[PDB]
Amino acid sequence: GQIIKSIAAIRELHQMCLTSMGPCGRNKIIVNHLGKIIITNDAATMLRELDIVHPAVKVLVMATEQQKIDMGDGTNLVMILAGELLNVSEKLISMGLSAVEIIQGYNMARKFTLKELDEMVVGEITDKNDKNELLKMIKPVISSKKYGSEDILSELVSEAVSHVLPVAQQAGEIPYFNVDSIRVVKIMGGSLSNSTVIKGMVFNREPEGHVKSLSEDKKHKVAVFTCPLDIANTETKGTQIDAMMKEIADMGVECIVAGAGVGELALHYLNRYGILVLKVPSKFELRRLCRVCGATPLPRLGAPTPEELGLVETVKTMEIGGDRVTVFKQEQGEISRTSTIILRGATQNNLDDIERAIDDGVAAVKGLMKPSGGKLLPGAGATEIELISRITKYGERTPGLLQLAIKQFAVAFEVVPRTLAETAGLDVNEVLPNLYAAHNVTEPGAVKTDHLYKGVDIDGESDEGVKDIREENIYDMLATKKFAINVATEAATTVLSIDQIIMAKK
Amino acid sequence: RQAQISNITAAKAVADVIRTCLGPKAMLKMLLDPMGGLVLTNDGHAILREIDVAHPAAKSMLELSRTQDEEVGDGTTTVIILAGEILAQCAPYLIEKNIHPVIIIQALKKALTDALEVIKQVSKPVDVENDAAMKKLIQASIGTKYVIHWSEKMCELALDAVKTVRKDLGQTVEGEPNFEIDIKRYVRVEKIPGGDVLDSRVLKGVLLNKDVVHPKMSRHIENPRVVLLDCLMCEQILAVRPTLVITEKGVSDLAQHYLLKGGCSVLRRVKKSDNNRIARVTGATIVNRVEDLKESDVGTNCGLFKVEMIGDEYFSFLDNCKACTIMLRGGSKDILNEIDRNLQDAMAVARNVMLSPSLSPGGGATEMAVSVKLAEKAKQLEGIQQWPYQAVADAMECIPRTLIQNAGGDPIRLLSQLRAKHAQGNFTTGIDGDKGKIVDMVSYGIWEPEVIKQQSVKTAIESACLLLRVDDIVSGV
Amino acid sequence: QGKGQIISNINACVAVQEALKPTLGPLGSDILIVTSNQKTTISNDGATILKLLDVVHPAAKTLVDISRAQDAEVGDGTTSVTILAGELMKEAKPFLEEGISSHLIMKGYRKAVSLAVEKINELAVDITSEKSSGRELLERCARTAMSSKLIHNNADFFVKMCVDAVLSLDRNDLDDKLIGIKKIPGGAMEESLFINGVAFKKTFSYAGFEQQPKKFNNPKILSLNVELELKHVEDYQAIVDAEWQLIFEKLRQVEETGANIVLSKLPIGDLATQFFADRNIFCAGRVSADDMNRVIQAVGGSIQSTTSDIKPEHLGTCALFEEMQIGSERYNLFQGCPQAKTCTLLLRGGAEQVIAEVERSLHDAIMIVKRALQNKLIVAGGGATEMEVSKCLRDYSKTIAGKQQMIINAFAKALEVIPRQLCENAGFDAIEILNKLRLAHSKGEKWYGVVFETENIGDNFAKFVWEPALVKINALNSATEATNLILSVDETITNKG
Amino acid sequence: SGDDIRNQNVLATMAVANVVKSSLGPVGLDKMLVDDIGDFTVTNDGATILSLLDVQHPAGKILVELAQQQDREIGDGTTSVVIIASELLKRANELVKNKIHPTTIITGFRVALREAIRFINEVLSTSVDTLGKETLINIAKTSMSSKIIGADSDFFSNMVVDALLAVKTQNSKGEIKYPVKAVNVLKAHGKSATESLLVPGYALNCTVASQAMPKRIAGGNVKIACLDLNLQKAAGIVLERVKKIIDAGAQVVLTTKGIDDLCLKEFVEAKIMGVRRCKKEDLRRIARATGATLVSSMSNLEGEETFESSYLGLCDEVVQAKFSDDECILIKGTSKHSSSSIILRGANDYSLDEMERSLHDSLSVVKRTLESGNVVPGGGCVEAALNIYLDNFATTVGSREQLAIAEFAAALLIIPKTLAVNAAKDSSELVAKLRSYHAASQMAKPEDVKRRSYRNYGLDLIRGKIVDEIHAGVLEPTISKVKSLKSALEACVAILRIDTMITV
């Protein structure tokens, strides 16, 4: 049985993710073959580092790539749903239900699940781009990464997000928020309260010039050059240095950036006269300077055409955690298209891992864009437990052997409320049966009131049963759920269809 | 938990052996002895007889089959299959869900109570005082025996047997014993060599194969006075007004003529143990020597005395008006023994219906009906017991599954059709053996004594607790 | 895999604890570390010990990384991080085997560190002039740091230098680079020479004596890098003079600068002293850029590799520059430089390791005074603070019900590993001291702790054994995080090749 | 020798504990015992589990041998010895690695016993607080919840106790113990289960031989003559025996072998109460209740009669009261009888046979609980209250034994710990809460400052809570728990004294 051997393989990565997902989750130590210690809860980082052996794993891993590239969340939702969807299929296999009949069932359930998810909508983010509306989503996204640190990270992100979401109104066809709109840097030392946000670009390299600040005027004009700065060389061969700034400043420039090297006298004179000098090793970061300072790089040398100058409010050199950085930023004007997250933290693993979490929080806001992304679902398995009950109803409505598959299909959605419990340390022999009753009630009405809000208690508030998601404002993104169901349903269908693994001609 | 797992793996194997031993189309099992013997029997008792087991849990599966067979003459493989899957379906609940055995045991007890409710609901009443229907019932219920051509009397012989043994008491003072029957002891069947199966008859009393000493003798005395003696003496006998003289030892001509002169019959070779059986049905006093005969030698409670010869042996009828003796007739003692193999089996069939006047929907309709009724109860039951409660429902589907598998049909699709037939339709929908089709038990009767299903479930859950309650296997002498 | 991955991870961190456990205390033991350069270092400095452990187990790499952060963020307490962090994990062994989950354990450790930091805040006493004079604030503390040592008889010698060594710094700017130590072989302990500023041992590797007056009341220090020494048939000479004249004029370009002291990073020989003797310019090459940058921070000069581009802006002047025969060798000293915030001590003694014992005995005493000026809030030493947190967290476990009660109790038990190792490493009866200390603390005295003079417990405030509050706070917070990092690992995935 | 044999000793005794660990508790799990013959047996009986346990390691022969003495000497306490001792040894090895000399460990454990015996003796309770409050009703309910009458046990258990409350006897020189075979109870079909009646006195299993004879004679003070030899024709002589009943003055006559038609009518004319055919065992208890002495044959140097003032007993009042198909002879009181009676009503005798099953157990268990005078709050109260008190004892010595006082005290939590593990309930939650409920009982309660500061709260294994085991009714003998601890340290010391093993 190839399908039996495949089940054995997925049991390995199922064990990996089963204990991973959740704010109470457990970290994994990952040793890079190049000599790096990686400790994270991100299963995408895990699978990137995990060598793949059994070809059936290649299906599940590439599935998580579809989720992670196309959606900034859902990594464990794919691995967790997929793991159990194939685990419960072992019962269907052993009951004698053929592979094609199991496949037909999961596809029939794909339609049932998607239609119900549309009915599970509780609220909707009205796209006010307000810090309060952002926090409603940013908090639960930061959750599952660092439990209890949401206060520090929420104030960091929601304020940083307001830097890259400018004042926009009547805008549903104008896209905003590129993933590169928020940069995160690492400064060894300090703690969470030592982190901050800069409204613009921060160079991790120490100040290279001798000038600390520009003038006090608003919208200090700035130049970027592409050609190497030296004594004017003729258009051909040749087998003035400082005169560049005499040309640049004509329009109002206090800051001169050189995308290339610097000539003899200018290295002294550009800084001597109080002008900031910059050369950037990252050429995409030069494209960032086009977005932060608004600077249009001059393709020629020593000829700052007026159209090749930008307007940047303030550029200064700043001290972060004792290690010096150079800041090219905007200030209440020519609003910066990039904001920088200043992470001060002493442990290089927690420091880097905090960045890994904030990177995902940035990605979540990309999904908070206009593509039908405001829809909210009830979190803490209220979506999952309610889906269980509604799926079993479709079983009663469905004649044939498809009834057997639908029944085992609902069982699979218990892995998410189970994982929330096993990681949190509440007895799965008590929390799970209390979840069933909390969501399974006889409502005097067609609208379940306060019974779609029943949650899973991951807090230390000792209580028999579970809590209400509105207490902490725990909502899940509908688009994350809907896309995840599509990925996992098709991914499990793929594994369930593998009848033989044949080596190609070699 | 590892020790409890090993107990589970034991019963799964016991069941896999017995699994396909159920049905008129049952597959045969090959018993290989180390001496080279090979037996293809379909008797699940014989299968369990030779199965050499390792885990003592399997030894309790054997003791379970002994318990069922001793009480209810049927239920052998029904209990082994049912009990094993009851344990097996609980396996992921033990290992994966981390459910403590005490929780699982408590859940099975609640399922037992609820299951007995369903068994009552699906029952069909039958009137045990309708002897004509009891003949049609027992004759069909003993189906597939060697005496089909003689089933008329091979059935009626058992009906007239249980007719009298019925332990009849009913009142609110002591209670209703419900016609408790002991076929082993209370019934003393006297198999008569000679005759044919259909010539077999039923008597009332005790019948002895001890022959008569003189061919001319008082043949019938309606109110005799029986002298039970082992050993002047012939005259001493008559002092107490006797009519029948029974001697333990051999008897000479003098005892024939002297007692005949006074109108007394002579019977020889009757041991004091048969003289005690005479006392059970008449009441004569057992005496050794004739000089010790006293006035207590009486022949009370003697309805009929008969001396007829059958099978080269004269018989002494101790007839009187929880005991009976059947005058079974057979061309040989092996034919008489063949009667037992088929007749006493009918006695169990009648014992079951006399135990409770109720029938069970066969063809597996009982089990699939339980699997549906438990499902409706499960979703209405709160607590962790929602998980183990469903285990019994999945276990009750194995019995109808084996009826399909041994019928050669699709074991998956036919079960799902049965589920829908019991869900929206009647509880009487079962499995046909020959056609392999889903049929209603109204058309294809196969109505089974309910007490078989009641004791099968009771003993299955009982043994399931015995297998789950064991936490380790420890060596000790 | 599974819960047993934690068992293995704890066992690894225990191994680290067992190696580091003998190092706690000024009376403690040393570890002999053989590095891959065949550079053998025997040290009780946990910062050096942790640097050179070369731990490979993935879990121990985390533990060591946490402790190396203690050094950069605080600078002291790196040993207490490793001992405290390890015992908090060792005491978790019975909890894991009983089925207590990683969240249940970690949530409790976070509960305890919150309860503890607040009790540390209550224990904090603000010592500026509070019941202490300015001189004895530093003096009595440094005298305590040096008590009962090999330098005990010279305590007045070393404390007189030690207290004013830090006091001679900028009280607004404390930095270890401003107190340097030279390992000067030869001379007795009391022969150690304190330099008001910076001195170096003249690595000038050639002759040239009886020339170049070497002492200056107002020198002009110039720093070079390059070597200005030199090293038809008659025409063969021209190539030698061609180069000689070049560097000889460059030697004049030094004279054109006007330097009295010329420094070099490269060897300077007698051929270079040809001109410097003719113009009488002291020159010392092969000089560390640390002492040269201290010249930059002493007299305010600049280092120019070449001789031509040098202007007066490169020169600086000290109050006294003197080469001395003190130390059975010539040493050059700068004292009273206008910009100098630094001082150095030339340690003389019977041997390099005898100096090392004085060196690290002093290095600690330097840090004792360093943080006397840095930190305003102090906490009790001798483990009294660890007993203070022990009593308070024990009381919280009495008033808290639930799984937290047992977990908090383990936290309190582990707090006594600090006084325990302080007892064992000093040779005391650990059973007796732990019991007498616990009961006496429970009688209300918050200052009782380990007395090293006489095996006993007593008031570490009266003994002026003071530890910084932030040393205790940041270390305790760091240890809690370390236990959260190790106890939270469920699986190790290694990409091999 | 050394730490090697010490480590081997602990592993052996922990393996023994792995056998009895799961058996502790009324809801525990059983062990399967397998011999080489091929037989198997499954039991939770601790004595049987240990008796058939094959121990190869020599250390376990000491631990088992103690428990063998425990059962033969006391009759119970076989499970606690192994579990308590194995925890003491598990924690002792930690003291060994902590540089605690084995002698110091033993010395302190003995000091803890001297302190613990005093604590247990102070915190125990006597055979009191059982009347008018549900201490024996909940104890009886415990035995009766497993019976078919369980639903109605509130009504039946009231009679189990109320009857036993009146049968206090002196036994052997005033033991103050209840008779096991007593309270003659009648299984009857009369009415519904909850209407069963409690009788204020004893009912000899019989009625008045003839319905014509008077049924209540000498209401104030009555003499009873029990005869065996019949009054039947063998007739004026066996009738005259009634004239001897008259002259000898027996007011209630218990004639075992029957009464002639003339004797029955002579009793009527004599206004004497006649009785026929009584149960012999009840007549012997009548000989001890009223004193009526069964005369098997009339000799006494040619005496033939009830033997005036000799073989007659003494009773207060004898009544036959009709209770709707119950007409039997009632015995009020007397100098010493200690007897009673209960009427059972229900569906039928086959259903009242459950009362035979119920009272056989319930009367036996309730009597066993009142067999011991001093009783213990069960449910880890005696283990957990020691945990709290012994913690404070740590301040009395506070030298080297302080470490052993703690480990001894902490080992006493293995019992409330194991009780929870075997019960499926959360072991860490239940044990911690047990400690906190007993913790505060040592603070203000002994200062007589209490709003609700009262101990004797213990582990409820059924409802899953911690409840006042006095109002819940779980009690254990003080002779058992005190002997249990005394036994436990006997083996703990014995194993800790093994520092060398030589194999020859």
Q: Do B103 and D424 touch (CB under 8 A)?
A: yes
- The type of residue at A292 is V
Identify whether residues B70 and B156 lie together within a single domain: no
CATH of domain C128-195+374-378: 3.30.260.10
C101 shares contact with chain A (CB less than 8 Å): yes
Phi, psi at C263, each rounded to 5° = -110, 155
A228 and A305 together in one domain? yes
One domain, residues A193 and A339? yes
Domains observed in chain D? 1-127+374-504 (1.10.560.10), 128-199+338-373 (3.30.260.10), 200-337 (no CATH)
Token couple for C27: 């009376």
- Answer yes or no: do B378 and B456 share one domain: yes
Residue pair C330/C215 in contact (Cβ under 8 Å)? The answer is: no
Contact yes or no for C254/C311 (Cβ under 8 A): no
CA distance D299 to D311: 13
CB C241 within 8 A of CB C215: no
List of residues 6+ apart from B46 with CB closer than 8 A? B31, B39
> Please, are residues C298 and C339 in contact by the beta-carbon 8 Å criterion?
yes
B108: tokens are 């099975």
Neighbours of A68 (CB within 10 A): 21
* Assigned CATH for C199-373: 3.50.7.10
Binary contact (B474, D42; C-beta < 8 A): no
Q: How far apart are CA D355 and CA D339, in angstroms?
A: 19
Q: Are A158 and A134 in contact (CB under 8 A)?
A: yes
Q: Are residues B342 and B374 in the same domain?
A: no
Q: B35 Cβ partners below 8 Å, 6+ apart?
A: none
The experimental technique used to determine this model is cryo-EM
Chains B and C touch (3+ CB pairs under 8 A): no
DSSP letter string, C269-312: -HHHHHHHHHHT-EEE-S--HHHHHHHHTTT---B-SSSSS--G
| Cα A303 from Cα C357, distance rounded (Å) | 66
Last residue of a domain, one of A313, A348, A374: A374
Tokens 């400052």 sit at which residue?
Answer: D449
The CATH number that applies at residue A343 is: 3.30.260.10
Q: Tell me the three state secondary structure of residue B187.
A: strand
DSSP A27-89: EEEEE-TTS-EEEES-HHHHHHHSPP-SHHHHHHHHHHHHHHHH-SS-HHHHHHHHHHHHHTH
Q: Which among D395, D398, D432 has the least Cβ separation from residue C405? A: D432
The token pair at C141 is 């503390």
The alpha helices in C21-154, defined as continuous H runs, are 46-52, 58-73, 78-90, 93-97, 102-123, 134-145
Residues B50 and B167 in one domain: no
B402 has catalytic annotation: no
Closest CA to D86 of D12, D22, D31, D23: D12
C182 vs A15: CA distance, rounded Å: 58
Q: Is B43 an annotated catalytic residue?
A: yes
Separation between Cα atoms, residue B350 and residue D3, nearest integer Å? 73
Same domain, B10 and B46: yes
CB C369 within 8 A of CB C197: no
Element (H, E) at D79: helix D78-97
Give percent helix, percent strand, percent coil of chain A, each to the nearest 5. 45, 15, 40
Q: Beta A253-258 vs A276-278: how paired, if at all?
A: parallel
Question: Which residue from A97, A428, A429 is facing B412, i.e. has the nearest CB?
Answer: A97
What range does the domain containing A299 cover?
200-333
Helices (DSSP H) in C124-227: which residue ranges? 134-145, 155-167
- Please say whether the beta carbons of B321 and B203 come within 8 A: no
Resolution for the entry shown, Å: 4.1
CA angle C200, C205, C208 (to 5 degrees): 100
Contact D286, D204 (CB under 8 A): yes
Work out whether the CA dihedral A428, A434, A438, A440 comes out positive or negative: positive
A221 with A245: CB under 8 angstroms? Answer: no
Touch between C and A (at least 3 CB pairs under 8 Å): yes
Distance CA A280, CA A270 (A): 16
| Whether the Cβ atoms of residue D250 and residue D235 lie closer than 8 Å to each other | no
Could you give the CA distance from residue D17 to residue D81 in angstroms, rounded to a whole number?
Answer: 10
Contacts (Cβ under 8 Å, ≥6 apart) of C122: none
Does residue B439 share a domain with residue B372? yes
CATH of the domain at A234: 3.50.7.10
- The structure tokens listed for D465 are 């809570």
Q: Which of B103, B171, B472 lies closest to D31 in CB terms?
A: B472
Q: Is C380 exposed, middle or buried (0-12, 13-18, 19+ CB in 10 A)?
A: buried
* A296 and A262, same domain (yes or no): yes
Q: Give the tokens for residue B447.
A: 């109505």
CB contact under 8 A, D35 and B471: no
A338 and A194 within one domain: yes
- Those chains having 3 or more beta-carbon pairs within 8 angstroms of chain B are A, D
Angle between helices C78-90 and C417-425 (to 10 degrees): 120
> Does the CA dihedral A273-A279-A283-A285 come out positive or negative?
negative
Question: What is the nearest CA distance from B372 to chain D, expressed in angstroms?
Answer: 29
> Pairing between strand B226-229 and B244-247?
parallel
Q: Is A436 on the interface with B (CB under 8 A)?
A: yes
By C-alpha distance, which of C112, C125, C110 is closest to C461? Answer: C125
Same domain, B55 and B184: no
How far is CA B311 from each of CA A299, B194, B196, B315, D381, rounded to the nearest angstrom? 131, 5, 11, 9, 80
Indicate the residue among A313, A345, A374 that finishes a domain.
A374
* Contact assessment for residue A410 and residue A393, using Cβ atoms and an 8 Å cutoff: no
Q: Which of A27, A148, A189 sits opposite C72 (nearest CB)?
A: A189
B131 shares a domain with B5 = no
Q: 3-state DSSP call for residue D223?
A: strand
Choice among B16, B43, B168, B196 that is catalytic: B43
> Do D179 and D169 touch, CB atoms closer than 8 A?
yes
Residue type, B278: I
Put simply, whether C351 touches D (Cβ < 8 Å) is: no
Name residue, tokens 């283990």. Answer: D383
The CA distance from A122 to A131, in Å, is 20
Do B373 and B339 reside in the same domain of the chain? no
Give the chain A residue whose CA is nearest to the CA of B410.
A96
Domain count, chain A: 3
What token pair was written down for D112?
């803890």
Q: Are residues B344 and B434 in the same domain?
A: no
DSSP tag of C26: T
Do residues A379 and A315 share a domain?
no
Dist CA C388 CA C384 (whole Å): 6
Residue from B199, B211, B340, B345 carrying the catalytic annotation:
B345
Q: Is D356 on the interface with B (CB under 8 A)?
A: no
Per-window interface: B 36-75 vs D, CB < 8 A? 56-57, 59-60
Answer yes or no: are the C-beta atoms of D179 and D337 closer than 8 Å: no
Which residue segment(s) compose the domain that B33 sits in?
A: 1-126+358-477
Candidate from C98, C401, C439 with C-beta closest to D433: C401
Q: What is the CATH number of the domain that holds B25?
A: 1.10.560.10
Asked whether residue A213 falls in the same domain as residue A260, the answer is yes
Do A215 and A314 have their domain in common? yes
Distance CA B264, CA B274 (A): 19
Q: What is the CATH number of the domain that holds B177?
A: 3.30.260.10
A264 plus A307 within the same structural domain? yes
Nearest chain A alpha carbon to B89: A91
CA distance B436 to B22: 15
What would the DSSP string read from start to end of C33-52? EE-TTS-EEEE--HHHHHHH
Dihedral angle sign, alpha carbons of residues D246, D250, D252, D256: negative
How many Å apart are CA D487 and CA D17, to the nearest integer? 16
For residues B409 and B469, state if they share a domain.
Answer: yes
Residues B54 and B139 in one domain: no
Tokens of C461: 């405030």
* Whole-angstrom distance, CA of residue A150 vs CA of residue A157: 10
DSSP-based three-state secondary structure for C215: coil
Distance from CA of C101 to the nearest CA of A (A): 6
Using DSSP's 3-state secondary structure scheme, residue D279 falls into coil
Active site residues per annotation of D: 45, 78-79, 361
Whether B428 contacts B440, CB under 8 Å: yes
What residues contact A370, with CB distance under 8 A and at least 6 apart?
A: A127, A172, A175
- CA C297, CA C292: separation in Å to the nearest integer? 9
Structure tokens at B400: 């109808």
Q: From residue A317, how far is each of A188, A252, A274, A290, A325 by CA, in Å? A: 19, 20, 13, 19, 6
Q: Show the beta-strand stretches assigned E in B174-251.
A: 190-193, 201-203, 207-208, 226-229, 244-247
Whether D429 contacts chain C with CB within 8 A? yes
Tokens of C165: 């060594």
Distance CA C91, CA C371 (A): 32
Residue-by-residue DSSP string for A409-430: HHHHTTHHHHHHHHHHTS-HHH
Question: CA–CA separation, D378 vs B123, rounded Å?
Answer: 49
CA B207/CA B324 separation, integer angstroms? 10
CA distance, residue A32 to nearest chain C CA (Å): 5
**Contact flag for B and D (3+ C-beta pairs < 8 Å):** yes
Residue B327, beta-bridge partner list: B190, B201
